Ligand binder design. Structure first.
Ligand SMILES: [Zn+2]
Ligand SMILES: [Zn+2]
Length: 57
């Protein structure tokens, strides 16, 4: 289910982040950090104001 579960940026780590405010779950944590500034969601291209773990903190 890699379309559903693999990070859409590297395709090498599982998705692990929720992007706010757009709400999309598309990226692992390393790819988020690596995103060029200003950081935008790979899915919808909205600015990412905050990252929270998909695994509930
Ligand atoms: Zn990744
Ligand atoms: Zn988005």
């Amino acid at each position: 289910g890699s379309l559903k579960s693999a990070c859409v940026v590297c395709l090498s780590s599982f998705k692990s982040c929720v992007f706010l405010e757009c709400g999309h779950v598309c990226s692992c944590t390393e790819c988020y950090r690596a995103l060029p500034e200003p950081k935008k969601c790979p899915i919808c291209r909205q600015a990412i104001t905050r990252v929270i773990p998909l695994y509930n903190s």
